[PDB]
Every structure is written in C-alpha cells, then in structure tokens.
Design a protein around this motif. Sequence first.
Motif, PDB file in Angstrom:
ATOM      1  N   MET A  20       1.462  -1.199   2.738  1.00  0.00           N
ATOM      2  CA  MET A  20       0.834  -1.823   1.584  1.00  0.00           C
ATOM      3  C   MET A  20       1.929  -2.295   0.643  1.00  0.00           C
ATOM      4  O   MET A  20       2.706  -1.483   0.131  1.00  0.00           O
ATOM      5  CB  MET A  20      -0.102  -0.850   0.872  1.00  0.00           C
ATOM      6  CG  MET A  20      -1.337  -0.489   1.670  1.00  0.00           C
ATOM      7  SD  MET A  20      -2.660   0.304   0.737  1.00  0.00           S
ATOM      8  CE  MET A  20      -2.647  -0.604  -0.804  1.00  0.00           C
ATOM      9  N   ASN A  21       1.992  -3.607   0.417  1.00  0.00           N
ATOM     10  CA  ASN A  21       3.030  -4.155  -0.443  1.00  0.00           C
ATOM     11  C   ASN A  21       2.849  -3.736  -1.892  1.00  0.00           C
ATOM     12  O   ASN A  21       3.757  -3.947  -2.702  1.00  0.00           O
ATOM     13  CB  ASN A  21       3.053  -5.675  -0.327  1.00  0.00           C
ATOM     14  CG  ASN A  21       3.627  -6.142   0.990  1.00  0.00           C
ATOM     15  OD1 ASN A  21       4.382  -5.419   1.636  1.00  0.00           O
ATOM     16  ND2 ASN A  21       3.279  -7.354   1.396  1.00  0.00           N
ATOM     17  N   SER A  22       1.703  -3.153  -2.236  1.00  0.00           N
ATOM     18  CA  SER A  22       1.519  -2.623  -3.577  1.00  0.00           C
ATOM     19  C   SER A  22       2.267  -1.317  -3.792  1.00  0.00           C
ATOM     20  O   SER A  22       2.728  -1.060  -4.907  1.00  0.00           O
ATOM     21  CB  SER A  22       0.034  -2.415  -3.851  1.00  0.00           C
ATOM     22  OG  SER A  22      -0.492  -1.405  -3.013  1.00  0.00           O
ATOM     23  N   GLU A  24       4.835   1.608  -4.287  1.00  0.00           N
ATOM     24  CA  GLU A  24       6.176   1.589  -4.852  1.00  0.00           C
ATOM     25  C   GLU A  24       7.227   2.132  -3.897  1.00  0.00           C
ATOM     26  O   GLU A  24       8.403   1.782  -4.032  1.00  0.00           O
ATOM     27  CB  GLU A  24       6.206   2.395  -6.151  1.00  0.00           C
ATOM     28  CG  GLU A  24       5.386   1.780  -7.273  1.00  0.00           C
ATOM     29  CD  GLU A  24       5.414   2.612  -8.540  1.00  0.00           C
ATOM     30  OE1 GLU A  24       5.978   3.726  -8.509  1.00  0.00           O
ATOM     31  OE2 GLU A  24       4.872   2.152  -9.567  1.00  0.00           O
ATOM     32  N   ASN A  64      -8.016  -4.083   6.018  1.00  0.00           N
ATOM     33  CA  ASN A  64      -7.053  -4.733   6.891  1.00  0.00           C
ATOM     34  C   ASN A  64      -5.653  -4.485   6.359  1.00  0.00           C
ATOM     35  O   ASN A  64      -5.415  -4.586   5.154  1.00  0.00           O
ATOM     36  CB  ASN A  64      -7.307  -6.235   6.996  1.00  0.00           C
ATOM     37  CG  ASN A  64      -6.823  -6.990   5.788  1.00  0.00           C
ATOM     38  OD1 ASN A  64      -5.669  -7.402   5.725  1.00  0.00           O
ATOM     39  ND2 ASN A  64      -7.705  -7.180   4.816  1.00  0.00           N
ATOM     40  N   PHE A  65      -4.732  -4.150   7.256  1.00  0.00           N
ATOM     41  CA  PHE A  65      -3.348  -3.938   6.863  1.00  0.00           C
ATOM     42  C   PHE A  65      -2.443  -4.189   8.057  1.00  0.00           C
ATOM     43  O   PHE A  65      -2.775  -3.836   9.190  1.00  0.00           O
ATOM     44  CB  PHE A  65      -3.135  -2.530   6.308  1.00  0.00           C
ATOM     45  CG  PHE A  65      -3.606  -1.440   7.217  1.00  0.00           C
ATOM     46  CD1 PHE A  65      -4.940  -1.095   7.270  1.00  0.00           C
ATOM     47  CD2 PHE A  65      -2.711  -0.736   7.991  1.00  0.00           C
ATOM     48  CE1 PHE A  65      -5.373  -0.092   8.096  1.00  0.00           C
ATOM     49  CE2 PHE A  65      -3.141   0.272   8.816  1.00  0.00           C
ATOM     50  CZ  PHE A  65      -4.473   0.594   8.868  1.00  0.00           C
TER      51      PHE A  65
END
Lengths: 197, 197, 197, 204, 202
Positions: A20-22, A24, A64-65
Amino acid sequence: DNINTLWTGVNPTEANCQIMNSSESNDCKLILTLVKTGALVTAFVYVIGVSNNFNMLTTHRNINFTAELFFDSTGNLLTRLSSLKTPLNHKSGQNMATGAITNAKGFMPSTTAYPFNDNSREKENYIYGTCYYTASDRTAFPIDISVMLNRRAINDETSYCIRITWSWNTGDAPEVQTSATTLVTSPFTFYYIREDD
Amino acid sequence: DNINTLWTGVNPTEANCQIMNSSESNDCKLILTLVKTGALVTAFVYVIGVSNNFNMLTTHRNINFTAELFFDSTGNLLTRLSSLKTPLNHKSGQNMATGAITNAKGFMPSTTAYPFNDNSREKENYIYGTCYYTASDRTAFPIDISVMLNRRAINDETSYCIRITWSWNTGDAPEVQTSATTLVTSPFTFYYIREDD
Amino acid sequence: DNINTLWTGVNPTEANCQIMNSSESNDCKLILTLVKTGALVTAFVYVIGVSNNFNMLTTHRNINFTAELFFDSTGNLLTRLSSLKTPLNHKSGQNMATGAITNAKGFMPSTTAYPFNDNSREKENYIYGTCYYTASDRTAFPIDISVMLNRRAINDETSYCIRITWSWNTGDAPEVQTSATTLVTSPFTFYYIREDD
Amino acid sequence: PVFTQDVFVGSVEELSAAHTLVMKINATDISYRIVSLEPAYPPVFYLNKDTGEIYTTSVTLDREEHSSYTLTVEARDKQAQVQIRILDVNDNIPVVENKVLEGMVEENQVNVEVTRIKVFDADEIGSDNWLANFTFASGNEGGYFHIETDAQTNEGIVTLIKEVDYEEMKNLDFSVIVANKAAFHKSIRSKYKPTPIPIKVKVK
Amino acid sequence: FTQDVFVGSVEELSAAHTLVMKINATISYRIVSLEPAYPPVFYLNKDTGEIYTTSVTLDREEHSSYTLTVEARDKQAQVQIRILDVNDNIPVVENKVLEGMVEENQVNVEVTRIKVFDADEIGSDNWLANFTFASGNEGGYFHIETDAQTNEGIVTLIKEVDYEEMKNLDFSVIVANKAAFHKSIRSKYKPTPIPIKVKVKN
C-alpha cells in the motif's frame, strides 16, 4: 545445488514489502520464491499482513492491491522502485544466502516471450489464477490474481518487470471488524519462460 | 537423479492406503509423488478406488474423505498412524526403489514456514485446490481439495503432517448404482516449502 | 542442463501447427515445453493464432479446438499425424537445439500410469484445467482445457498421445468483428508421470 | 460431374466437437464447393473439396439458435441441396416460472387436482430433453401428493389422494425439484444446483 | 489555497493509486475531514497534495460523491470528488409473470411491457436496457423498443394474425444494457432467456 532458488526467505523477522503506497513503512511480508525448472521458472508467491491498514482490508468487499518487482539488466532487485524492499538471494537453509548473485538474469522473464511496448503481442504478457483466504470460520474465500510480465518499463533502469495484483470483488466481505486478524493469501504458483543465463 | 523423488509407485498392484474410517482393511490406492524443485517440493496426489464401499461414494451427492500422512523426525512415513500403509521410497523405473532412505527429511513440509500449534499463524498452514472426477458420460465433476500442512501433532512421534481432504457437493450424483466403476480423481499438484535436508 | 527440456521454441517465426483441420496450411503457433521434474513431466502449453480463420474464433460464443501430438516409440513427434508440424528439441537459448535426441522417450506419458485401450482404467487418462483469454477490453474469459494422455493409438506407429482440447462457452462473444486481433490463450501448466528413459 | 441425388439429408448432434463428420456427398461421372449456406452464419460446416465430406468446424453448433442448415453445394470436374438438421442435446436446465406458488386443498376430498406448476425448458418441444420430471425434495414423507407431467404443455399437475380434516391444520407444505426426463448433458451436469422450489398447501 | 472549492472525478472500480486529483495551494496538506468518511477510499499525499485512490475499491452504487475538507500548513478548503459510473451491474427482469395477448387481425399494437431493473446510474447507457429476441421471432413479427423514461421494454406487434391459425407467438428474449458490460462482469454474464407468452384473442 542451492543456486537454483532465488527467494525472499521463510517468514522474515520484519516486513520486507510495501504494498500500500499509503503506508509510511513496510506493511507486509512478501514471500516470493523462484525456481529454475528447465526452460521455465516456477514462481511461488504470497503475502502476510503486518500493518493494521493492510489487515483491515478483509472487512471490505472490493479490494485490490499490487506488488511490483523491477529488475535491472542483470536481474537484481531495484528496491528504490519495487514493492519488495529487500534484495532477493539464493537459499541458505531457511534463510537468504548473503552473497553476490551472478546468475540473476536467468530467473527473469524472457524479453522474447514477454516483450516490452509491443502492442501486437500485448496479450502474451498476462497470467491469471486464484488464491484463497482462510476465514476465521474455516471457509475458503477466493482471491483473483493477475500477473503481468515484462510489458512496460517506466524507469529507464528497469529491464524486467513482474506485477502481481491480488483482487477480490464479492458481495460480502470475508471478515467482520471483530473477527479480522491477519490477511494471509494461500500460495500462488505460476510458471513463466525464463531469460537466457 | 532418482534421489529427488519420493513416491508410492505408479499403480501398485494391491491397495496401499485406508482412506475411510469405516474400512477394515486397505480400500484404495493413494498415488503420491514428491519432487524436490529447489526450495520447494512439488506434490502430486490422486486416489484410485479399490474397495466397493469407496467406489460406491460416486453414487452420493455430498462426499468427503481425508488422507492423513504422518512423518517422524527423519521423514519416514509412520505407517501405523498414517492412511498410507506402505512407506514412500525413491524412484526405480515405475516401481518404488527398495532401499534405505536417508534424505527423507528434505521432502517434509517446513516447520518454519508451516508451524505446529501456533494460533498466530494458523492461516498459513492451508493449501487449496480443485481436482476432477470423470464420470461414465464424460462429465467432469469438480472436487475441492484442502491440504493441511504441519498444524497439529496428535501423536508424540509425529514431526510432520499432511492432511489431504477431498470433498464434493453436487446437485446430481456423478454415477448411479448400475454405472459406477471406480472413484478415480484426476491428479492434483500443489507446492510446499521443504524442510532443510 | 539443456537436455532437461523438450519444446517448440519461443515465438516461432512462422506458424508451426495446424489446429483447424479445415485450414490449408499452418494456422497457429503452438508453444509447448516439456520439462523433466523427477518422476514427473511439467507440460507448458499455449497457442497464438496466426491465420484469419483461427482468429475469427474470438467473435463466437461457443467454440472448441484441439491439438494432437502423436509420438513414436522413441519420443519423436509424428509430424505427419500430429497437429504440430515442427519436431520438438532441446533448449538452445530461446530457440530449438539442432541435433538428434536420444532421450525423448523420457518425456512421454507413462504407458503404465496412462494405459492404452484399458476401459477399467480409462478415467486415469484425463487431466482438466482452465486457461484464460485476455480480450481487447482487458477481461479474462475462461477457457476449459481437457488434456487426454495415452488413450488410443490410431496408427501402428503411434506409441504415445497427447490431446489438448481448448473450449469456451460464454454469453457474450469476447470480441466483435472490428476488434478481434489474435486468439492467444494464457499458458497452461500440467503434470504427468513420465516413462522410464 | 453428376450428382447421385438432388437432395441430400444428414444430421449432426448439438455441441458436437470440431471435425465431427456430418455427412458425405456422393458424386460420380471431382471438386466440391459450398456455393451457399442458409442461414449463412456462423461458418459451422466445412466441405472437403476432395472427398465431399461435410464436417463441423470449431464453431460449436447450437440448436437453440438454428435448428436447420441448408447447404447448396456445386460439383465440378448443377448444384445439390443438402438439409442438415441439428439434433437436440439436453443443454438447458428447466426453470419454474411462477415464483408465487400457493396450493389449496378442499376438506375431505380425494383424487382432485391441487395445483399446476408452469415450467420452461428451451430444448426441443416434444422430446425427453424438454419434458419436466418432478421429484419430491422434501415434505411428502407422509405420502399424500403426486406429481404428473402434462406433456401437452409440460406442466406439473400436483394431485392429492388423501382426505384432510380442517380442524387439524396439518402442515402439508412441501418442496419439489424440477429436472428434465433425460439426464442433463455432460456440459451442464455438475453445473446443476437443484434449488428446491416450495409449495404451500392450505386446507379449506 | 488557489481555490476555495476544488472539483475532480475518479472512475468507479479504479485500481489502487489512481490519481484522483491534485490540491494546489500557494506546504503540508492533510484531510481535516471526510464525508461520508467511510470506507477510507482516498489517500492524500501530504508532500505533493495529490489525492489518489487506495486498496479499498470504490463503488458508485454505494456512494455517488465524496466531500473532503482539507488543510494546508507551512485555512481549510473543500474538495468534491464525483464517482463516475461503470457498467458493472447486469440488468434484472423484475416481473416474472409476462403473458401478453394479441388481438385478432391487428397491427401496430403494444403487446406488453417488460419491466427491467438496473443498479447503474439512471439515464446512462449503463442503465438503459437493450432487448434482443433469443427465439420465437425468427419470422420477424414483434418489435421491442427501450423506453428510456422508465427503462421498459415496449413489446409491439406489426404483423397480422388469424385467431383460427393460433400461431405460436410466444417468444424468449434477453436483456443487456446499451453500453458494453464492464470488464469485471463480462465472462460472468449469462443471458438466460426470459419467456413471454403471446395469447391470441378470440
């Protein structure tokens, strides 16, 4: 005898992938194993959730990922771009064999079989399958997997690409809030033609 | 080159496993092949019906049956607790290679990847799949397969465990009393990370 | 190392198989790769349409097409009887090796595991699966795959048989006449017990 | 070239696989050619210009779409007409139309028609691939009701043969499953889930 | 901020990390508030101000639009994100009792109406129903039009009929939206025929 595997290890101590690019920091364990079987490569991939943002997905219906793996001309992992942030290596027991990889290119998808930026052969670059999620009530929840091989190279340093997207789109989420503990995808094994050593 | 396989042999003359708890003696043939592919083991299993009771399952709509394989610290099959009553052995032509096995531990499921009695990693001990039963009218009935790796050691001497459960739940029985010949499941192939030799 | 594969090459320059018996000349590129995996053989097969008639099939809701590979007693493709018209050979880079093969027999289906003309064991000769077709709008239509190993040696010289039947039955034709580009099915990987060298 | 017949007639089963021999056209005195085809689409038949054997192509035949093909074939060194019927295979699960089914039984009456169940199947009318075969999924363990198949319209006539006393309010509601007389085709077996349909019986 | 109210859009069923829009200010950005504020379907990159999508996939049918209250730090601004519709809901024929009747020797008549439900956006090609005759009209007798005000199948007859002939005018039809189905439901579409019975008036 061990140079025929190139993997991420078994149950790494800490997270090694950022899906997940969210998030950190690294939010999951990506267990990826690649084995040379003649002219093919058997790829054995799955994911274990570590972060809470990653684990909460089982409470939703449409998820989705994707995990993206970029490899330079010699087959080394580009950790600055890939979802996996720990370079791949050979098998040393149940761990990664700390050492220099000289035959990484042999484990990479063939540019002949899976060309870049070739619309006429675009359809050749797709693989599909299904994994499963074991619910807290022992039910198998199917998850579609789409794998895209060397079809696009954004960064100029990228010579090979492997994108693995896990997605499910159902009417009822596999878990409810009070039951979701972790997201573990059943192993997915897919074969692809390998680049010449 | 034959030390990389542990199998039950192709078409044993007599039944070699007891698949139903109701059976007094061996009631089917469990063809099971394990091949070392780098850090993975490729398992290849199916069951051929021999006893009449087992063959009559084709006349039911809701069937399941489980084969349990238990292996000691050295990977030898515990024939007393397991369903398969004939030890696995290496390849010698199409027959079992009569002789002593020393590298058996290399084929067993990894305890680091697939742990015993760990509630925090229960989900990662399951493999799933589908095989098929070919009827007399050539219609293919799917059979769900659940494979449980080392998750529970009921007996003290058990060090590794594989439980293969076949189950189908269909709306029309694949066969009738007058047509059933034998319950042959099409081969099922799965993968698992192997313990260190 | 190269002697462990037997394949049609990667992206042959010209069509090398005649799937549709109506077609005048070669109408598809059949990519096939057989790899020895201990006691088993990993078969890796898919098709790339070439002729216009073959690619028309993407515009019809119900289709099926079959590829037959007949092998002699030594493991050499019977090009005049099989669909594939180019002999299989070992790995030389991405291309077929040039030279004779003396161990093609090892790659063939086991006549013990998969017998000829034995009704009582007929069910053993089937393998089932599903591949996918990626359409122009990025939708993966499933394709049922029926692989029949040694079942019937029609001609006196046919010692082994592999019959791979693709079929689909859908409610919306994957393409329309103005969008159909090429019928490419995603790779299919199956396993079969191999004959003694 | 001389045709042996002005009209040839053949037959090929529905869902027959590719390269299935539909028939052979005999000619004596040769190159054969399909001049024309009704309904001309999709290309489901292939004529061997050498032997004259009409085969099926990879495009699977669907009878539910077109029940008959008319081929005009010319022989060369006149044209013959070939009528290829497509034979039905049971590739349609019958479906009960009325979603609101409620029965009514008169007190102390026997050998009376209780209900009629309307069912639809898309296969050939008049054939065993179309007539409905009803079975009692549950509720008729007491042996009160009986279902017959009116073949004229393919309906389920549910009749009662036992008396009922109103003061009882016996629960006679039951549930039936609908399937064709002939067994389902290999393509739709294992895709058949006989979701039981319910029927409530109210005693006057 | 460069605008008190920004407006962008993102397509339903979009993959992860689809650039919904970019918030410009004249800097650290942050989502002060959301509405309906559940699920968490968007992510605001605090460094660049770009709003992307997340692993929790969107559904227009569940929420048509989202309102975000964002801040810039070194004031609050509004961001309205409209969810664009995709054809991911197959039509359902509401009525099951479809038994029409044809008057003897009449033409240009409205035989019946087929009620259709579609969950997609109302008024779009994702919601209008397109009818075709699966069977029973091989002779070209009936005509089906889509009434877009109600998304109904107007079933009319243009050909004559003789009651004594009692021609079998029953027919089976199938339903699909005007626009092509989204890739997530194609290969799952199964056009089961819906019969309609045509009774011939005495």
